[PDB]
Design a protein around this ligand. Sequence first.
Ligand SMILES: CC(C)C[C@H](NC(=O)[C@H](CC(C)C)NP(=O)(O)CNC(=O)OCc1ccccc1)C(=O)O
Ligand SMILES: [Ca+2]
Ligand SMILES: [Ca+2]
Ligand SMILES: [Ca+2]
Ligand SMILES: [Ca+2]
Ligand SMILES: [Zn+2]
Length: 316
Amino acid sequence: ITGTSTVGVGRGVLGDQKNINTTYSTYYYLQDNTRGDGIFTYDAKYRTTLPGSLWADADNQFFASYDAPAVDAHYYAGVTYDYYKNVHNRLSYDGNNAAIRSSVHYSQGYNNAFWNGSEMVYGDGDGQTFIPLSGGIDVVAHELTHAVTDYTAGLIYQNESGAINEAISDIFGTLVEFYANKNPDWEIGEDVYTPGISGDSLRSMSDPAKYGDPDHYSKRYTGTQDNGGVHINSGIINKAAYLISQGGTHYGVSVVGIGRDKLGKIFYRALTQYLTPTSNFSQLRAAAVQSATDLYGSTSQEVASVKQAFDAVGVK
Ligand SMILES: CC(C)C[C@H](NC(=O)[C@H](CC(C)C)NP(=O)(O)CNC(=O)OCc1ccccc1)C(=O)O
Ligand SMILES: [Ca+2]
Ligand SMILES: [Ca+2]
Ligand SMILES: [Ca+2]
Ligand SMILES: [Ca+2]
Ligand SMILES: [Zn+2]
């Protein structure tokens, strides 16, 4: 859409008011011209045909219930773009300011969100297991991060490399949640999962076992479902990442925490410089150790904490 940049206001999934970047040309569109080559939000209209229609509104006010998921997918994708640029100096997912596209209201009662190889897609949930998925900033950043991985390490979505792929998305989705300071935690999907149950979440990084996911390599899923447990074995890496940042004693192994910022720095560098499509857990350990060495020196505390964390979850 060619037109004039403006700013509209709307209400998100959780009922919060926010300003969003729009474009005016007869109608007001969900097109943000301020970030890279743009952020574009589409209406999939309860269908599965993608991307749908670029989102058009007559008055630049998005307070209708149908508007909510579009407001949050659009705003959160801008925050995520900002985190990557400001913290890691990366311009969009491809590092060259590629336009970011998202489609909301996909299918009917769809309990998921995904990156399709080219855009982000968000279900509205069935109203019980989930509310519209774009209302969770960690969900939005998890999605966008699948694009970053695809453009960098290219981790195949199955078995060990696939669980690394999932852990990266959970790790950066949590870092983005802390960055925006939106009631941050080490849990995934809490803001959009089981609207009737308080206190739960989809996965836990602090204690993956809480929901039945492994927190040690010896408890790894060896089966075939979920692409060989990509959403299951990611718990082993999630736990390692939480220990590096926060510290703690796990299975008798003590880790001194080095904080989130450094965790982000070491993970980003492993991702963009050392990981490959087929990397396994043991290769990730080597990658993280080498990144920390590059950044802080072989004899630093940072390197020491990375080794301890991996030894705690039984990776190597
Ligand atoms: C019950 C669901 C939410 C759990 C799980 N999905 C998830 O954990 C998150 C959403 C979550 C952060 C809210 N979605 P995802 O990005 O991991 C699903 N992606 C996904 O399955 O991607 C594979 C794919 C490749 C190419 C084209 C299309 C799809 C799953 O698919 O098993
Ligand atoms: Ca309107
Ligand atoms: Ca939170
Ligand atoms: Ca969270
Ligand atoms: Ca809940
Ligand atoms: Zn994922």
